[PDB]
């Protein structure tokens, strides 16, 4: 038993925190309010190793592990206000990266893999639907069988990255199966977009599959394993996105204790009230004892354990203390808070599709009921 | 002790919700969709009667009392989605009339109330400022004393109903006093908008005053009077805001309830998985607390007797309830929630500024404790 | 709409807690000390009016509503620290002089009503075993038809009062098919035979309140001994715990406004640091909690009771009162522990022993999942 | 960063939950229901090594480290029942063999300390009284020096193990002026002259705990019997409260350990509708708060007995695991009593007096206020 971050891993997350606070916090303020997501950037980002997660050197990635890949992301989370850049990048990571790194052929890899690991091509990932988006083995999405490949119909909604995705990750029922589609292919039509508020300035529309010739290479994994890679990729979700946010939530506590130890008022800091210092001791008890949760899931992963209730654990307790801390933050900052330079409503409302992702809480609920033996 | 709506009571809350729902719900989706405040309807729920609160039936009021008023308030957060709209009205009603109607000279009232009143003048009020939003006794707005009136100098922000306002109720030091400012009057600058997502298309901006001379009579009460005349406005506000919440929530539980007898899983409608169950049954006791609370203020008030602290009581309680039972609507919702066109999302968003305009809560708090003899 | 107490409610309110204050407080910290019942205590508050409800004028009641009745509850939990003998008079109150008012013929009324009504007869209420507890459908008490009237046979534990009952209200099987209508109800008189009443086991929750099992070995219950018509029983009971719910509401609700005073009273004496411990926003952010608390369920239990009064169906306002005032009981009750320290636990000062009696709130007439199920179904989930 | 325990950590806890589940845990039902407790099941688990704490193998110690201690202290707090018998020995070993190991001259420590850590004497501490229980600094009890010593008067309240202790560890007066440096801490002889331990005052709240309150009527205190130097003892008695809230902290995390696997059993079980209850979402949610709960302050916990044991500085991370742990022991006892619903007040199945006996964790070393303070100022609030 040890809490000390190894040698290796606090220079892992202190490279990427000084990446977050001087590249791309820098201007985020401008971004933001413009709502501009800046491909620059992104590339930027990605080529530094946020892209990376537990890809090989061979494609460019850093073989990283699940702990160090979660210490990346919350650096990312504490040092940028750019969310939504964050939230692309996530995305990017573990539903088109780390599927195609795990899953896809060497023929496969070898065209895409290194390209996308290193920040050359954007990626969009495309699973949900009106009624398929929670069960995502009822799709409105069909790839039949044809010579020497697939014919693709339907229309996914919701797809993050698509407005800047040089490819598509897309499930299919056949079973369903996964394949990667790249921009442009004939038939294939990106639409635009409706305006965002909740990771306001991460780019998201809709796609339409028109007759859609897939060669038969672009599959990824065996026919019908779709939902097993589609698993995979949720399970990654679900620990980057806990990652983020347990960030977000050291940052909302430093920004808020800044506000409480300068905020003079009857001739004190406000701190010194009770109310505030009470939302202030709230906000570090939830966020030692979640982040100790998810470090524990990264760990047992790293292990070789089965760290799937861990992190279901994980998504659950940040989901809920990051709402709560954005509120009591509200509370705190009152009538400064709606200051869109202070960013913080924007910063809950990026919040709110922590339960609305990679399953509500009675998801991990499910997931935890089973492990403990309840059904 | 009785706990039905006397006849009386009911005709004014079953006209405000037809009328809420028959007229201004009608086309509220893309109003709302398009950021638009329309002074069309807002006019005709003006001269309805929403307007009026307890004005006098010589200048076009009703004489509605608080338990009237809170009743036409919750039809109206109940029946219309619009609650942009709903918030501009409740605004112009309190910060303006009625301050008008019990603290100004018969000139005054002669000259403005009636027009306020059945909506052919929109109002916006002005007393809060970077350093002075909550201490409305240092304030940087000065109207010095001058042959036949004063000349006013400063700089509000954040004024509702600005950009649509066609009179102004200005709080300035001299104490502090109150002032009824026409728009266009020569050094009066009103600014244009920065965009806004907590009651989105609800106008507000900042107005410039460079030298304005005020007229004598244009002063609302005596000199030194602003502070009680705004403390007056801000009871008004807060049980108004409270009633509107009341009738948002009653909306949001019936559309909750909706969604779980139809929405079927597994066999049966979802309402009989204890989750969705559980967290309707939430709601329900949260908005019966909190209504029977409301209604029993506004009851002592209409008594004569001091209800201060009822009231504090009252919104304390509905801000709180309010946001928990959104994000339990999220939760309920999942990923049907950020439907724009269902405008949960935005409905919490609107519901933001609850602890943040009237007091935040430890405002409440220090009202409670004072009563209860704890200071 | 009207938040005022009539003048008649405000004698009723008035008029009880001072009888609680005065006679049943008086000596309350001896008599709970030495974990004692008074049945001299438990006669007068009884014959005062307690044991009324909304029985007439004609059986010596004062014939008051469920309102009425709730604002007696209320003073006598908020003046008498003897919460144990507060819960013995509400059960015999609503487990036995309702029910027998409410469904009996003229000849058991007549025999025995006036009886419990005026505190002469004490009266136990017994429908819960170890599996039947619940489920009182499911129960291993069979009271057969037989000639001029019943045999019954059984075992029926946690009866509150049984060491001093006079009567027993008893719930048995007698049509063993399905049906919501196979259970009766009958009045029993202690010492009949075959009744054994037991021993009092060690009490904390409630503790002076005197419970133990009783078991029938072929009880001869007579015809005219049975409440109501047969199969009844179910709606018997089902009516009981109605009207248990909503006095236990008020008792607690009483408590609670007790606790409140209590903890103001300390908090402004109490001087810490050059100023009284009431400033300290921690001690006053949990009183402030305590008086939401208290009057949101007070006017929910208010409304239910009322809305009974007016002939309306008043059974998910009472679960939602039930519900409001469990919970929040326990969670000032903790608040309070947290404000006095070390304090608390004084014996004398009653407040750790406030919420062990406060306990079985949720362990009486339904933990809060059934107070839920009430509401879900009233609200259409089923 | 590991989650693994060690092979010797493991060790550690299996024996020590091997010793609580057959040693301890095997007749607890009986001396609970007679508030027994046992002096020889008290000597045996001190000998074992719950008294030895960090105390080095010189004096009969295991050279346990803080981490160790908490996992053996929360062995036994999951596998034995007697929980009281558990806080007399976590008291023992906080409140007086760590004191004395710590800040003991070696001819005090040579005389008591190897007596202490392998129980053949039973050590009680001494530092609360009316008004003296919070601020260990405004003290009505008083130790003048004199010749070849001091002189003791005063009377200490709500001492822990005094009817069966034979020493105490005294904090006393010694420069009645200002600074945080005029109590220091003595350690005295059960019989000794002017000394009077009273009869013990019913208890519930850790019912078998024996506690009373002791008087010192002019003691004679020899000079070699003060624990460390002059005015240290404010020093000594914060570091016996940080010790004493690790060791408590894992006592509950234990419980709340034993809390979860038989709240689960139950649930796997008892069929109601045709299936297991722990399909009710309801009662499957509140073993699922018990599960993130118990995980989240044990991490807490065991990083803050880390901290320590790098020398890193502890304080404040022992304070969030107090409150913590304190909270969600409240809370899952309650969730507990609401998933049994009638069978909870089950004396032998222990549920109510075990949230009885969780009670008193913000009633000892610190309400939860308190630890909000050291919080609050270790974060830069003050």
Request: negative net charge.
């Amino acid at each position: 038993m040890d809490f000390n971050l190894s040698n290796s891993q606090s220079d892992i997350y202190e490279s990427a925190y000084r990446f977050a606070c001087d590249v791309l916090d820098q201007d985020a303020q401008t971004r933001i309010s413009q709502k501009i997501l800046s491909t620059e950037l992104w590339k930027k980002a990605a080529a530094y190793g946020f892209a990376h997660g537990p890809v090989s050197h061979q494609f460019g990635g850093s073989e990283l592990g699940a702990l160090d890949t979660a210490l990346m992301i919350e650096a990312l989370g504490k040092g940028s206000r750019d969310i939504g850049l964050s939230f692309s990048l996530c995305a990017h990571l573990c539903a088109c990266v780390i599927p195609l790194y795990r899953f896809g052929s060497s023929e496969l890899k070898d065209k895409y893999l290194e390209s996308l690991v290193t920040g050359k091509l954007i990626a969009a990932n495309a699973a949900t639907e009106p009624d398929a988006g929670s069960d995502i083995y009822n799709m409105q999405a069909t790839a039949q069988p044809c010579e020497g490949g697939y014919i693709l119909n339907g229309k996914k909604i919701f797809i993050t990255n698509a407005p800047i995705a040089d490819v598509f990750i897309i499930y299919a029922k056949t079973g369903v199966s996964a394949f990667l589609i790249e921009k442009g292919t004939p038939g294939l039509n990106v639409g635009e977009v409706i305006p965002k508020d909740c990771l306001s300035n991460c780019p998201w529309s809709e796609i339409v599959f028109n007759d859609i010739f897939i060669p038969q290479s672009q599959r990824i994994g065996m026919e019908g394993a779709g939902g097993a890679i589609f698993h995979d990729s949720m399970i990654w979700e679900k620990g980057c996105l806990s990652a983020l946010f347990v960030g977000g939530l050291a940052r909302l506590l430093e920004t808020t204790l800044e506000y409480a130890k300068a905020r003079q008022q009857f001739g004190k800091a406000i701190g010194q009230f009770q109310s505030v210092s009470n939302r202030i001791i709230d906000m570090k008890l939830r966020l030692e004892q979640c982040r100790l949760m998810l470090y524990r899931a990264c760990w047992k992963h790293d292990q070789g354990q089965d760290a799937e209730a861990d992190i279901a654990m994980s998504k659950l307790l940040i989901s809920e203390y990051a709402v709560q801390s954005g509120l009591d933050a509200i509370q705190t900052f009152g009538g400064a808070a709606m200051d869109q330079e202070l960013g913080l409503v924007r910063h809950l409302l990026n919040m709110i599709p922590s339960r609305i992702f990679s399953g509500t809480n009675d998801i991990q609920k499910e997931i935890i009921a089973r492990k403990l033996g309840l059904r």
